[PDB]
Q: What sequence folds into this?
């Protein structure tokens, strides 16, 4: 189409957030107003300030868990590696799979990761032992295990770090240095659990009159990005488009390192508009920084309005919300979280509510404010959404996204095709059947030609192999429960693991090859369908941590 | 309400009404006093936390 040669596309997502196993669950959580903080009743004898010192936590179950063997890692070695690195490693694998791609097949990829300094090394016994887990090891470990050639490095701007990754990818993919770019962010801390910005009750009530602070969180996620034109031509699955992103720093205008400044925020926002030229009236929803501070939240809108106002403004047409309300403030993954939420809303053309809001902050002036606070689901009938992240440092980010609009879905021309399912361990293969299994029914009609297509390509050939040659979803499905149901030799199935004819071997398509795949080296690429987001490799649940 | 033994009655109605470096000067007539003063401010600070030093 038009301004697509200057844009990026989000073609893959993988994430884990409080109360979210995956990006799909995540969305459905926010859409329905679910809040993922957690509270304790019966578990030190300090029942005092809050035990603000912080009475409730926002938690990621299984931050320790890992599947080290997948990557050729000693168990001893995992215990030395940071949890944030491990998580970003699994997610980077996952995100590319959700894209439908095999890393190895897209060497031309850039990697930008960011994570916190949790001083993880500090919990190891006293150690010979070389310090190289550094921040740099994270992106670089990932490039090495996925076989990526793109420039690979680590970026951090505190709260703004993910948008910094997003910025790098935007420049990088435009500059032709890389065909694909991979951006991820994580925070996992290494602990148990006035004069600050801590919330009184542990509720981030963003845009509420009684907003008195914020609460901490843990999360990790990654997305895969492609040039937009390429994505359509190449036929990838696109959630959303990234039009532009901007970065800058406050300078020494405001009084203090921790002070957010009106003028500084305004400029990124202005700066980005000029870059994309996008007209504010164009914008349906804005995901604000939305920390929940008395003074931070007046400033954001103040800045937003001041920019928006000079434009063909006047109204109250734009939705403004913060997902921090649901999850908390994830220092380094704050940008990632907002980003995924906005990408999902555009994907589904719905607006997620912002919870913990009863009244409007008098200071906001929302009424002159071109944008109304979110409190309900939305109807949307492309649309553009914006995202803000402002660093503790004084580094500010703003970004805009565009809906991706056209599907002309077609029925299945051919009545049978072949799934090739595989895993690095049999236990894994079974769950994969389960995870897949659950999905089919959950998504009631999904094409398998593409489901077939995406597993044929975009999933690697693991040793344990199970290949299915069905024709009908229920048909496939139960036969799956047939495989899951372990030793009934019923199905049109083919056990996997259970020689090289590498040399110059022609192969003719037309028939059942599953056997040949079942212990073989077949290249399913003749017939074609579109790549699609299905379930991804189920990693084992081994926990590793330092005693 | 308050009504006296005398036969004098009274009634009343009330209504509900809605930096980085500080200096605190503390003084007393005597040194224990000034010291007792210190326990109490200390004790006060413990209990009430979101209490502004400014």
A:
């Amino acid at each position: 189409p038009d301004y697509y040669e200057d844009s990026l596309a989000v073609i893959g997502i993988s994430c884990e957030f409080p109360g979210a196993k995956d990006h799909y669950e995540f969305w459905n959580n926010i859409k329905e107003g679910k809040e993922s903080i957690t509270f304790f009743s019966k578990e030190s004898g300090i029942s005092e300030e809050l035990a603000p010192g912080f009475p409730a936590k926002s938690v990621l179950e299984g931050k320790e868990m890992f599947d080290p063997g997948f990557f050729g890692f000693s168990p001893k070695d995992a215990e030395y590696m940071d949890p944030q690195l491990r998580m970003l490693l699994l997610h980077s694998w996952k995100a590319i799979e959700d894209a439908g791609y095999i890393s190895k097949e897209i060497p031309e990829t850039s990697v930008y990761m960011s994570a916190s300094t949790n001083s993880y090394r500090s919990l190891l016994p006293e150690e010979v032992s070389w310090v190289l887990a550094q921040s740099g090891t994270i992106p670089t470990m990932i490039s090495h295990k996925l076989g990526l050639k793109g420039p690979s490095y680590f970026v951090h701007a505190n709260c703004s770090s993910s948008l910094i990754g997003l910025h790098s990818a935007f420049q990088s993919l435009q500059s032709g240095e890389a065909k694909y770019a991979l951006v991820g962010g994580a925070t996992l801390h290494t602990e148990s659990s006035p004069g600050l910005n801590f919330s009184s009750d542990g509720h981030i009530k963003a845009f509420d009159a009684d907003a008195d602070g914020m609460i901490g969180g843990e999360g990790a996620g990654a997305v895969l990005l492609k040039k937009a034109s390429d994505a359509v031509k190449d036929g990838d699955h696109i959630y959303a488009l990234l039009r532009g992103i901007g970065v800058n720093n406050d300078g020494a205008d405001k009084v203090g390192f921790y002070a957010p400044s009106v003028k500084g925020q305004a400029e990124v926002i202005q700066k980005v508009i000029d870059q994309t030229g996008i007209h504010p009236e164009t914008i349906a929803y804005v995901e604000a920084h939305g920390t929940g501070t008395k003074l931070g939240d007046p400033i954001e809108l103040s800045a937003l309005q001041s920019v928006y106002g000079r434009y063909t403004d006047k109204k109250q047409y734009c939705g403004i919300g913060s997902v921090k309300t649901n999850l908390g403030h994830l220092d380094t993954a704050a940008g990632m979280a907002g980003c995924i939420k906005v990408v999902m809303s555009l994907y589904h053309q719905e607006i997620a509510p912002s919870i913990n809001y009863k009244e409007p902050n008098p200071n906001l002036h929302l009424e002159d404010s071109p944008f109304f606070v979110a409190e309900e689901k939305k109807e949307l009938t492309a649309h553009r959404m914006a995202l803000s992240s402002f660093g503790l440092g004084g580094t500010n980010t703003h970004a805009i996204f565009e809906q991706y609009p056209d599907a002309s879905e077609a029925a299945d021309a051919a009545g049978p095709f072949i799934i090739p399912l595989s895993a690095r361990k049999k236990d894994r293969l079974k769950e994969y059947a389960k995870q897949l299994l659950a999905f089919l029914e959950r998504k009631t009609d999904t094409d398998l030609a593409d489901l077939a297509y995406t597993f044929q390509v975009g999933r690697e050939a693991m040793e344990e192999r199970a290949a299915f040659i069905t024709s009908g979803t229920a048909e496939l499905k139960r036969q799956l429960a047939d495989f899951i149901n372990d030793k009934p030799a019923v199905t049109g199935c083919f056990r996997g693991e259970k020689e090289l004819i590498e040399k110059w071997l022609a192969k003719g398509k037309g028939p059942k090859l599953c056997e040949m795949w079942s212990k073989g080296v077949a290249i399913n690429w003749h017939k074609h369908p579109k790549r699609i987001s299905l379930p991804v490799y189920p990693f084992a649940k081994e926990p590793y941590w330092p005693k």
In short: The CA atoms of residues 18 and 187 of chain A lie 12 Å apart. The domain at 1-410 of chain A is CATH 3.40.47.10 (Peroxisomal Thiolase; Chain A, domain 1).
